[PDB]
Amino acid sequence: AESTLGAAAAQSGRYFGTAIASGKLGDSAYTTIASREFNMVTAENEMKIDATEPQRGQFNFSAGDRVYNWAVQNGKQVRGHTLAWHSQQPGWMQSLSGSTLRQAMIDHINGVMGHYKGKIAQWDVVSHAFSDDGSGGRRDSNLQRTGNDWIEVAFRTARAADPAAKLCYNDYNIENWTWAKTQGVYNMVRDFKQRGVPIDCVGFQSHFNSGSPYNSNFRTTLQNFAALGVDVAITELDIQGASSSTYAAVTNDCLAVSRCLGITVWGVRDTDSWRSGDTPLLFNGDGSKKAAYTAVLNALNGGGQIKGVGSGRCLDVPNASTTDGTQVQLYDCHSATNQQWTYTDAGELRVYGDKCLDAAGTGNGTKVQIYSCWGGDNQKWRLNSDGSIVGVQSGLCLDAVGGGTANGTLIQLYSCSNGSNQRWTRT
Ligand SMILES: [N-]=[N+]=[N-][C]1O[C][C](O[C]2O[C][C]([O])[C]([O])[C]2[O])[C]([O])[C]1[O]
């Protein structure tokens, strides 16, 4: 299987997951995409401390189970998130400290893991344990104040509670190998493995943006941790701007590491993202697949002019015009600039540098032309493996009008038919 993310990842023994919000399980558009595309689920908030133990000793798995059941019922495994960390703690726990806190932490772990014993693939036992101050040390938290050994204690407690779950340490900004935070975690995990502390995986949240950008050395980081004898997982991936290239690079980084279990993107549609402003996911609010989706799928499936297969002619802007609204056509292939198209990370097909292949509408017969680039979804395109080029907004295929093949044949949008007049090759 290779038309969906999860199925494609499965080809190499991995998974492709997302974060599920219980409040959206009633949204048909949401669940249609989620159930179809992913085979691993993480509760976005339903399994956190405050949600699972609102009152000390008073556990509530209502929201957590709703997500877990939806996942398993729809063929997805589940990553437990999260058992012990400083954020989103319930009121009662926030007012705790010292030995009473340590005991509360242990009790919480036993209660939650006990409830899901044997049903969880991976548990983010501890997360956000390190600081961003650049020192490479632990962050000052109620948990940390109970003693530096709290992390180790949490893992040992977890192993005993559910020996079948892979136990991960999860954090952010630990992707770039040169960062001090990354080294602090690396040193901790190494020490743990040397002393026999039960840790099976390290989760890299992968929340990339211009503030903490993706760097190719992320693969090295994954490989270095893998070499320590633990599995690695990309747990909450989202990329500011959703560059097709960056999304493909991250996907390939996991595929290049034997120990990388899989990749989870933090949400389904940009509208469901905790950072919608950064439009960091693989699907748009209207549910359309972004160019990034195609890039990720292509990667999971095993990794200039635009020539029409059926006509043998190239996508051409009539008389090298630069006028907005000029409908494109088929023409004998040559080296002029009016036949050179660049596919950008934003999914555009540019010509002349600042002009974009543009759909003047959404229905069949819609004119395909050039127009000033501005970021519209009607200027976004998906270059599919079968040679088809689909408009993001319309969901229709680039089509040579009436199957025409002669110079001057115009280009339009039309329901995809896999016809020769809808297949294109770049050469
Ligand atoms: N970086 N880091 N980390 C992360 O972040 C994000 C989160 O999630 C969130 O939380 C909050 C709420 O509100 C929302 O919805 C969600 O999404 C996670 O958990 C972490 O880890």
Short mmCIF file of C-alpha atoms and ligand atoms in Angstrom, two decimals:
data_model
loop_
_atom_site.label_atom_id
_atom_site.label_comp_id
_atom_site.label_asym_id
_atom_site.label_seq_id
_atom_site.Cartn_x
_atom_site.Cartn_y
_atom_site.Cartn_z
CA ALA A 1 0.00 0.00 0.00
CA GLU A 2 1.32 3.42 -0.83
CA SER A 3 -1.43 5.99 -1.42
CA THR A 4 -1.60 7.04 2.26
CA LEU A 5 1.10 8.10 4.75
CA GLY A 6 0.68 5.31 7.30
CA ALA A 7 0.55 2.55 4.69
CA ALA A 8 3.59 3.97 2.91
CA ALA A 9 5.60 4.17 6.15
CA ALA A 10 4.58 0.59 6.91
CA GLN A 11 6.48 -0.50 3.79
CA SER A 12 9.69 0.03 5.74
CA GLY A 13 8.28 -1.25 9.03
CA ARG A 14 7.52 2.21 10.38
CA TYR A 15 4.44 4.28 11.14
CA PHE A 16 3.22 7.78 10.38
CA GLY A 17 1.04 9.31 13.05
CA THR A 18 -0.68 12.45 14.22
CA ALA A 19 -1.97 14.08 17.39
CA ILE A 20 -5.70 13.53 17.92
CA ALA A 21 -7.93 15.99 19.77
CA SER A 22 -10.95 14.32 21.38
CA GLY A 23 -13.01 17.46 20.80
CA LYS A 24 -12.66 16.99 17.05
CA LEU A 25 -13.70 13.34 16.84
CA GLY A 26 -17.19 14.59 16.02
CA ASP A 27 -15.89 16.44 12.94
CA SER A 28 -16.45 14.19 9.88
CA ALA A 29 -13.91 16.01 7.71
CA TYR A 30 -11.35 15.68 10.50
CA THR A 31 -11.86 11.97 11.20
CA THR A 32 -12.07 11.17 7.47
CA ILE A 33 -8.51 12.42 6.98
CA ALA A 34 -7.17 11.13 10.31
CA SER A 35 -8.50 7.58 10.00
CA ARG A 36 -7.33 7.32 6.38
CA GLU A 37 -3.81 8.77 6.63
CA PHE A 38 -2.30 7.73 9.98
CA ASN A 39 -1.54 4.48 11.79
CA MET A 40 -0.21 5.91 15.06
CA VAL A 41 -2.01 8.26 17.43
CA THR A 42 -0.96 10.50 20.30
CA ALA A 43 -3.61 12.18 22.47
CA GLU A 44 -2.93 15.89 22.10
CA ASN A 45 -3.93 16.55 25.74
CA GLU A 46 -6.21 13.74 26.95
CA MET A 47 -3.48 11.67 28.59
CA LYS A 48 -1.60 14.48 30.30
CA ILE A 49 -1.42 14.66 34.10
CA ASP A 50 -4.23 17.16 34.71
CA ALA A 51 -6.56 15.29 32.35
CA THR A 52 -5.92 11.84 33.85
CA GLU A 53 -5.71 12.73 37.54
CA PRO A 54 -7.76 15.92 38.17
CA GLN A 55 -7.78 15.13 41.90
CA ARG A 56 -5.03 13.19 43.68
CA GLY A 57 -5.90 9.50 43.69
CA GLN A 58 -8.95 10.38 41.60
CA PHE A 59 -8.20 9.19 38.08
CA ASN A 60 -10.34 10.13 35.09
CA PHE A 61 -9.65 8.28 31.84
CA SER A 62 -12.79 9.46 30.07
CA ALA A 63 -11.09 11.67 27.49
CA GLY A 64 -7.99 9.49 27.31
CA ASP A 65 -9.95 6.32 26.59
CA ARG A 66 -12.09 8.05 23.98
CA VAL A 67 -8.93 8.84 22.00
CA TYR A 68 -7.33 5.46 22.67
CA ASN A 69 -10.46 3.57 21.59
CA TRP A 70 -10.84 5.66 18.43
CA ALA A 71 -7.22 4.90 17.57
CA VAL A 72 -7.34 1.13 18.06
CA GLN A 73 -10.80 0.85 16.47
CA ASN A 74 -9.37 2.56 13.39
CA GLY A 75 -6.16 0.54 13.17
CA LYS A 76 -3.72 2.87 14.92
CA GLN A 77 -1.33 2.14 17.76
CA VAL A 78 -0.97 4.75 20.50
CA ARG A 79 1.87 6.78 22.01
CA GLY A 80 1.13 7.67 25.64
CA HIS A 81 1.73 11.37 26.33
CA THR A 82 2.83 12.27 28.97
CA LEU A 83 3.46 10.73 32.42
CA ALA A 84 5.80 13.10 34.26
CA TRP A 85 6.65 16.72 33.47
CA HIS A 86 6.38 20.27 34.82
CA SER A 87 3.72 21.52 32.40
CA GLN A 88 -0.07 21.20 32.60
CA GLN A 89 -0.01 19.71 36.10
CA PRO A 90 -3.32 19.60 38.01
CA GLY A 91 -3.86 22.14 40.78
CA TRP A 92 -3.30 19.71 43.64
CA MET A 93 -0.02 18.47 42.14
CA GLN A 94 1.24 22.00 41.49
CA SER A 95 1.01 22.71 45.22
CA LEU A 96 3.06 19.62 46.06
CA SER A 97 6.81 19.37 46.67
CA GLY A 98 9.56 17.20 48.12
CA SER A 99 8.99 13.54 48.98
CA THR A 100 5.23 14.05 48.77
CA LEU A 101 5.68 15.20 45.18
CA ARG A 102 7.98 12.31 44.31
CA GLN A 103 5.39 9.93 45.74
CA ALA A 104 2.66 11.74 43.81
CA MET A 105 4.70 11.39 40.62
CA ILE A 106 5.20 7.68 41.20
CA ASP A 107 1.53 7.21 42.07
CA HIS A 108 0.47 9.02 38.91
CA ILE A 109 2.69 6.84 36.73
CA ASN A 110 1.40 3.63 38.29
CA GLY A 111 -2.20 4.77 37.99
CA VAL A 112 -2.08 5.81 34.34
CA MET A 113 0.17 3.03 33.03
CA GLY A 114 -1.78 0.51 35.07
CA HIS A 115 -4.99 1.61 33.35
CA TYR A 116 -3.43 1.16 29.89
CA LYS A 117 -1.16 -1.78 30.74
CA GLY A 118 -0.13 -3.67 27.61
CA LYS A 119 -2.09 -1.44 25.25
CA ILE A 120 0.50 1.30 24.65
CA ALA A 121 3.33 1.07 22.11
CA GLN A 122 5.35 3.95 23.52
CA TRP A 123 5.06 6.15 26.60
CA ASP A 124 6.63 9.58 26.90
CA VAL A 125 7.53 8.94 30.53
CA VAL A 126 9.43 12.19 31.04
CA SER A 127 9.47 15.30 28.85
CA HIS A 128 10.75 18.90 28.86
CA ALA A 129 13.33 18.03 31.51
CA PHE A 130 16.08 20.25 30.10
CA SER A 131 16.55 24.02 29.97
CA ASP A 132 16.83 26.36 26.99
CA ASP A 133 19.26 28.73 28.73
CA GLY A 134 22.10 27.18 26.73
CA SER A 135 23.76 25.65 29.79
CA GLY A 136 22.72 22.11 28.92
CA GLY A 137 21.29 21.40 32.35
CA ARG A 138 17.92 20.50 33.86
CA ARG A 139 15.14 23.07 34.03
CA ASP A 140 14.17 24.22 37.52
CA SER A 141 10.84 22.54 38.26
CA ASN A 142 8.87 21.20 41.21
CA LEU A 143 9.79 17.72 39.97
CA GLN A 144 13.47 18.57 39.56
CA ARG A 145 13.56 20.01 43.08
CA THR A 146 12.54 16.64 44.53
CA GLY A 147 15.96 15.43 43.44
CA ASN A 148 18.01 15.06 40.25
CA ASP A 149 17.22 11.34 40.23
CA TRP A 150 13.53 11.92 39.55
CA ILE A 151 13.95 11.10 35.85
CA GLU A 152 15.62 7.76 36.59
CA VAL A 153 13.02 6.98 39.26
CA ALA A 154 10.21 7.70 36.80
CA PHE A 155 11.63 5.28 34.23
CA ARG A 156 12.21 2.48 36.74
CA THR A 157 8.67 3.00 38.01
CA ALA A 158 7.35 2.89 34.44
CA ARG A 159 9.19 -0.30 33.52
CA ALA A 160 7.68 -2.13 36.49
CA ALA A 161 4.19 -0.73 35.85
CA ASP A 162 4.14 -1.94 32.23
CA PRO A 163 7.14 -3.97 30.97
CA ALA A 164 5.57 -4.14 27.51
CA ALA A 165 5.69 -0.42 26.74
CA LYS A 166 8.70 1.24 25.13
CA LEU A 167 9.72 4.04 27.49
CA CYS A 168 10.83 7.31 25.88
CA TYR A 169 12.33 10.57 27.10
CA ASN A 170 10.74 13.36 25.02
CA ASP A 171 11.95 16.93 24.44
CA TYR A 172 12.20 19.82 21.97
CA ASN A 173 15.15 21.79 20.59
CA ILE A 174 17.31 18.67 20.90
CA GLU A 175 17.39 18.08 17.12
CA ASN A 176 20.45 20.15 16.21
CA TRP A 177 23.52 18.17 17.27
CA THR A 178 25.52 21.33 18.01
CA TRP A 179 23.11 22.68 20.64
CA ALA A 180 23.98 22.36 24.33
CA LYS A 181 20.47 21.14 25.12
CA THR A 182 20.94 18.23 22.71
CA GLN A 183 24.19 17.26 24.45
CA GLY A 184 22.69 17.40 27.93
CA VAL A 185 20.04 14.89 26.87
CA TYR A 186 22.59 12.81 24.97
CA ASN A 187 24.80 12.58 28.04
CA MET A 188 21.86 11.65 30.27
CA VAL A 189 20.65 8.87 27.97
CA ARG A 190 24.18 7.52 27.54
CA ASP A 191 24.66 7.48 31.32
CA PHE A 192 21.29 5.75 31.70
CA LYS A 193 22.18 2.97 29.27
CA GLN A 194 25.59 2.46 30.87
CA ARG A 195 24.07 2.07 34.34
CA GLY A 196 21.11 0.02 33.14
CA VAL A 197 18.41 2.64 33.66
CA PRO A 198 15.39 1.29 31.73
CA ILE A 199 14.95 3.72 28.82
CA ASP A 200 14.04 2.38 25.37
CA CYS A 201 13.63 5.50 23.27
CA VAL A 202 14.27 9.20 22.82
CA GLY A 203 11.52 11.30 21.30
CA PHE A 204 12.41 14.35 19.25
CA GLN A 205 9.44 16.71 19.14
CA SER A 206 10.76 18.43 16.01
CA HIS A 207 8.89 21.73 16.25
CA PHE A 208 10.83 23.55 13.51
CA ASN A 209 10.58 27.27 12.68
CA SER A 210 12.93 30.14 11.78
CA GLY A 211 13.62 30.50 15.50
CA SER A 212 14.79 26.88 15.80
CA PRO A 213 15.19 25.71 12.18
CA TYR A 214 15.62 22.21 10.86
CA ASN A 215 19.24 21.39 10.04
CA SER A 216 20.47 18.37 8.09
CA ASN A 217 22.57 17.41 11.11
CA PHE A 218 19.32 16.21 12.71
CA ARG A 219 20.00 12.89 10.98
CA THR A 220 23.37 12.75 12.74
CA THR A 221 21.67 13.41 16.07
CA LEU A 222 19.25 10.53 15.43
CA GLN A 223 22.13 8.26 14.42
CA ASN A 224 24.20 9.23 17.48
CA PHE A 225 21.35 8.42 19.85
CA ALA A 226 20.56 5.23 17.94
CA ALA A 227 24.18 4.19 18.43
CA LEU A 228 23.62 4.38 22.21
CA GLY A 229 21.27 1.41 21.91
CA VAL A 230 17.88 3.14 22.06
CA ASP A 231 15.18 3.62 19.46
CA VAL A 232 14.41 7.13 18.27
CA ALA A 233 11.11 8.70 17.23
CA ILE A 234 10.02 11.99 15.66
CA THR A 235 7.13 12.77 17.99
CA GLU A 236 5.50 16.17 17.32
CA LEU A 237 6.70 17.28 13.91
CA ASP A 238 5.48 20.55 12.41
CA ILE A 239 7.40 22.97 10.21
CA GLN A 240 6.71 26.69 10.02
CA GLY A 241 5.62 27.29 6.44
CA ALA A 242 5.48 23.56 5.73
CA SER A 243 8.30 23.59 3.18
CA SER A 244 7.93 20.55 0.93
CA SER A 245 11.72 20.10 0.94
CA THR A 246 12.08 20.30 4.70
CA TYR A 247 9.19 17.91 5.26
CA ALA A 248 10.79 15.44 2.83
CA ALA A 249 14.21 15.89 4.44
CA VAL A 250 12.87 15.10 7.92
CA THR A 251 10.98 12.09 6.57
CA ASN A 252 14.13 10.80 4.88
CA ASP A 253 16.14 11.32 8.07
CA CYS A 254 13.91 8.79 9.85
CA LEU A 255 14.06 6.38 6.89
CA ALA A 256 17.86 6.61 6.98
CA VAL A 257 17.99 5.43 10.60
CA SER A 258 17.19 1.78 11.27
CA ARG A 259 16.14 2.59 14.85
CA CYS A 260 13.74 5.38 13.88
CA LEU A 261 10.36 3.83 14.72
CA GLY A 262 8.27 6.38 12.88
CA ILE A 263 7.18 9.99 12.53
CA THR A 264 4.22 11.80 14.07
CA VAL A 265 3.06 15.23 12.88
CA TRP A 266 1.48 17.37 15.60
CA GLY A 267 -2.04 17.57 14.19
CA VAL A 268 -4.17 16.91 11.12
CA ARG A 269 -5.05 20.22 9.43
CA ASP A 270 -3.41 23.63 9.92
CA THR A 271 -6.66 24.77 11.49
CA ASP A 272 -6.21 22.05 14.14
CA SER A 273 -2.63 23.09 14.91
CA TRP A 274 -1.54 24.62 18.20
CA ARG A 275 0.34 26.99 15.88
CA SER A 276 -2.03 27.52 12.94
CA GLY A 277 -0.34 30.86 12.35
CA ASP A 278 2.74 28.98 11.15
CA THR A 279 0.61 26.78 8.80
CA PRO A 280 2.96 23.91 9.82
CA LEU A 281 1.02 20.74 8.97
CA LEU A 282 0.33 18.57 5.91
CA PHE A 283 -3.33 19.44 5.23
CA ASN A 284 -5.01 22.82 4.75
CA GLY A 285 -8.07 23.91 6.72
CA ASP A 286 -10.34 22.92 3.85
CA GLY A 287 -8.81 19.45 4.04
CA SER A 288 -6.75 19.65 0.86
CA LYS A 289 -3.35 17.97 0.71
CA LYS A 290 -0.47 20.44 0.54
CA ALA A 291 2.53 20.06 -1.73
CA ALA A 292 4.31 18.97 1.45
CA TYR A 293 1.98 15.96 1.73
CA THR A 294 3.00 14.76 -1.72
CA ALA A 295 6.66 15.25 -0.83
CA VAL A 296 6.32 13.19 2.35
CA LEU A 297 4.39 10.40 0.60
CA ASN A 298 6.94 10.28 -2.23
CA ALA A 299 9.73 10.01 0.34
CA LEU A 300 7.97 7.19 2.21
CA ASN A 301 7.47 5.39 -1.11
CA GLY A 302 11.19 5.38 -1.81
CA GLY A 303 11.97 8.83 -3.16
CA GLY A 304 13.27 23.32 -16.09
CA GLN A 305 10.73 22.32 -18.73
CA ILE A 306 7.48 20.51 -18.00
CA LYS A 307 6.68 18.24 -20.94
CA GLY A 308 3.27 16.80 -21.71
CA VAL A 309 3.54 13.04 -22.19
CA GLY A 310 0.77 12.71 -24.75
CA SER A 311 1.82 15.70 -26.86
CA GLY A 312 5.57 15.65 -26.37
CA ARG A 313 5.34 19.45 -26.12
CA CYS A 314 6.19 21.79 -23.23
CA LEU A 315 4.21 24.02 -20.86
CA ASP A 316 4.70 27.43 -22.47
CA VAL A 317 3.75 31.04 -21.75
CA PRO A 318 2.66 32.47 -25.15
CA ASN A 319 5.30 34.74 -26.70
CA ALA A 320 7.22 34.95 -23.43
CA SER A 321 4.48 37.26 -22.13
CA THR A 322 4.61 38.34 -18.49
CA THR A 323 1.10 39.78 -18.44
CA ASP A 324 -1.09 38.56 -15.59
CA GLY A 325 -3.97 36.50 -16.94
CA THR A 326 -2.06 34.99 -19.86
CA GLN A 327 -3.30 31.42 -20.31
CA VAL A 328 -0.48 28.89 -20.75
CA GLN A 329 -0.21 26.48 -23.69
CA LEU A 330 1.63 23.54 -25.20
CA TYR A 331 4.53 24.37 -27.51
CA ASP A 332 7.61 22.81 -29.06
CA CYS A 333 10.13 22.46 -26.25
CA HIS A 334 13.06 24.89 -26.19
CA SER A 335 15.39 26.64 -23.73
CA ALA A 336 13.72 30.05 -23.43
CA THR A 337 12.72 31.37 -19.99
CA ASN A 338 9.02 31.21 -20.87
CA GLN A 339 9.33 27.41 -20.65
CA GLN A 340 11.38 27.15 -17.47
CA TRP A 341 9.29 26.33 -14.41
CA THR A 342 10.53 26.17 -10.82
CA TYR A 343 8.68 24.12 -8.21
CA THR A 344 9.08 25.97 -4.90
CA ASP A 345 8.84 24.73 -1.32
CA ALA A 346 5.54 26.60 -1.13
CA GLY A 347 4.19 24.36 -3.87
CA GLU A 348 4.24 27.00 -6.61
CA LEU A 349 5.30 26.52 -10.21
CA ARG A 350 7.15 29.75 -10.97
CA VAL A 351 8.31 31.30 -14.22
CA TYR A 352 10.29 34.53 -14.80
CA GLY A 353 11.06 34.43 -11.08
CA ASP A 354 7.93 36.11 -9.71
CA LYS A 355 5.04 34.80 -11.84
CA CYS A 356 2.99 31.77 -10.73
CA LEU A 357 1.06 29.06 -12.59
CA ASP A 358 -2.44 30.16 -11.60
CA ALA A 359 -5.94 28.64 -11.72
CA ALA A 360 -8.62 31.24 -12.43
CA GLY A 361 -11.28 29.14 -10.68
CA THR A 362 -12.08 25.66 -9.36
CA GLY A 363 -14.34 23.82 -11.80
CA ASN A 364 -13.65 21.81 -14.94
CA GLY A 365 -12.52 23.98 -17.81
CA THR A 366 -10.96 26.54 -15.48
CA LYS A 367 -8.27 28.50 -17.30
CA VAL A 368 -4.68 27.89 -16.17
CA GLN A 369 -2.51 30.99 -16.56
CA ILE A 370 0.30 33.02 -15.00
CA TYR A 371 -0.43 35.64 -12.35
CA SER A 372 1.70 37.51 -9.80
CA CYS A 373 2.70 35.12 -7.01
CA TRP A 374 0.91 35.88 -3.73
CA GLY A 375 0.51 32.59 -1.85
CA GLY A 376 -3.00 31.64 -2.92
CA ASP A 377 -3.92 27.95 -2.86
CA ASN A 378 -4.99 28.32 -6.48
CA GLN A 379 -1.27 28.84 -7.16
CA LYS A 380 -0.25 25.66 -5.29
CA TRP A 381 0.30 22.38 -7.12
CA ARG A 382 1.04 18.77 -6.23
CA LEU A 383 3.37 16.88 -8.59
CA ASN A 384 2.17 13.30 -8.23
CA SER A 385 4.16 10.13 -8.81
CA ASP A 386 1.92 9.17 -11.73
CA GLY A 387 2.97 12.31 -13.60
CA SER A 388 -0.22 14.22 -12.88
CA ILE A 389 -0.13 17.79 -11.56
CA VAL A 390 -3.04 18.61 -9.27
CA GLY A 391 -4.16 22.05 -8.12
CA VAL A 392 -4.36 22.21 -4.33
CA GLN A 393 -7.44 24.44 -4.10
CA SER A 394 -9.41 22.78 -6.91
CA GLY A 395 -8.26 19.19 -6.58
CA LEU A 396 -8.29 19.07 -10.39
CA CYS A 397 -5.59 18.07 -12.88
CA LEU A 398 -3.57 20.20 -15.31
CA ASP A 399 -5.17 19.24 -18.60
CA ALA A 400 -4.40 19.93 -22.27
CA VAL A 401 -7.79 21.09 -23.59
CA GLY A 402 -9.60 18.44 -25.61
CA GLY A 403 -6.56 16.20 -25.57
CA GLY A 404 -4.99 18.57 -28.06
CA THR A 405 -1.31 18.01 -28.84
CA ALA A 406 -0.41 20.76 -31.34
CA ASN A 407 1.35 24.04 -30.56
CA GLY A 408 -1.20 26.46 -29.15
CA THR A 409 -3.24 23.85 -27.31
CA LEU A 410 -4.41 25.64 -24.15
CA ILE A 411 -4.14 24.38 -20.58
CA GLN A 412 -7.05 24.07 -18.15
CA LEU A 413 -8.16 22.31 -14.98
CA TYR A 414 -10.14 19.11 -15.41
CA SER A 415 -11.21 16.12 -13.34
CA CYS A 416 -8.19 13.82 -13.24
CA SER A 417 -8.48 10.94 -15.70
CA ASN A 418 -4.87 9.75 -15.91
CA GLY A 419 -5.06 10.54 -19.61
CA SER A 420 -1.91 11.27 -21.62
CA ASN A 421 -2.99 14.92 -21.78
CA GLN A 422 -2.81 15.07 -17.97
CA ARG A 423 0.60 13.44 -17.56
CA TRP A 424 3.74 15.56 -17.39
CA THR A 425 7.45 14.89 -17.04
CA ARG A 426 10.21 17.29 -16.04
CA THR A 427 13.22 17.29 -18.36
N1 LIG B 1 7.77 22.32 22.52
N2 LIG B 1 7.11 21.57 23.07
N3 LIG B 1 6.39 20.79 23.67
C1 LIG B 1 5.09 20.41 23.11
O1 LIG B 1 4.34 21.63 22.94
C2 LIG B 1 3.01 21.40 22.44
C3 LIG B 1 2.24 20.53 23.43
O2 LIG B 1 0.89 20.33 22.97
C4 LIG B 1 0.03 21.41 23.16
O3 LIG B 1 -0.06 21.67 24.58
C5 LIG B 1 -0.93 22.79 24.87
C6 LIG B 1 -2.34 22.51 24.35
O4 LIG B 1 -3.18 23.62 24.62
C7 LIG B 1 -2.28 22.26 22.84
O5 LIG B 1 -3.57 21.95 22.36
C8 LIG B 1 -1.34 21.07 22.59
O6 LIG B 1 -1.22 20.84 21.20
C9 LIG B 1 2.96 19.20 23.59
O7 LIG B 1 2.26 18.38 24.51
C10 LIG B 1 4.37 19.49 24.10
O8 LIG B 1 5.08 18.27 24.25
#
